[PDB]
């Protein structure tokens, strides 16, 4: 049986850890909600 616990506020935080790239990927979305790489 599932339950919820508050983890904090939704706020934009200045000076946060900036990381991660921005790829342009070719994908397909199936009926079950699964994304996949189209090549």
């Amino acid at each position: 049986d599932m339950y919820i616990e508050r983890a904090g506020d939704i706020t934009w935080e200045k000076d946060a850890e900036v990381t991660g790239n921005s790829p342009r990927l070719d994908v397909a979305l199936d009926e079950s909600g699964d994304f996949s790489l189209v090549e």
Binding site: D1, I4, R6, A16, T19, P23, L25
Partner: protein, 156 residues
């Protein structure tokens, strides 16, 4: 029950100890999360009960107590913040510039951050702190890393 606006952990006492299965957003009296996290099942908030109201497996979304309330969208140019809520760890903002998922039905923003499976449902925010979508439904690229879509629902 606790209906305070904010980010929440979705926990289960079914497996060994308490295990975090996902994350969700409370806004305007509605709980927003990903379908694969709860599989439509009812939630407990202290002693209060949250019952599902809307859901869709293809979109991989589900709302509780009311219709989907989140309607902000990524502008296509600005950096965004993933408010990652990882299992057993504190909520942590991480700024990234999203990529693009090119599909036959249109383009979708995508955040290239790698976090445990229990982080599914963590909100992605714009400069004013508005939720532009949820992190948790994506794909694994060539180098084994994880790239999630910026999944946003429709507001009626």
């Amino acid at each position: 029950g606790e209906t305070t606006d904010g980010v929440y952990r979705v926990m289960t006492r079914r497996l060994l100890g308490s295990t975090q299965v996902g994350v969700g957003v409370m806004q305007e009296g509605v709980f927003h999360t990903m379908w694969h996290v709860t599989k439509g099942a009812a939630l407990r908030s202290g002693e209060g009960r949250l019952d599902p109201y809307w859901g869709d497996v293809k979109q991989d979304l589900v709302s509780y107590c009311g219709p989907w309330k989140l309607d902000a969208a990524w502008d296509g140019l600005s950096e965004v913040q993933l408010l990652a809520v990882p299992p057993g760890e504190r909520a942590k903002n991480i700024q990234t510039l999203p990529g693009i998922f090119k599909t036959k039905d249109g383009d979708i923003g995508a955040v290239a951050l790698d976090y445990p499976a229990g982080t599914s449902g963590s909100p992605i925010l714009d400069k004013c702190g508005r939720v532009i979508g949820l992190y948790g439904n994506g794909v694994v690229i060539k180098n084994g890393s994880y790239v999630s879509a910026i999944t946003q629902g429709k507001r009626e």
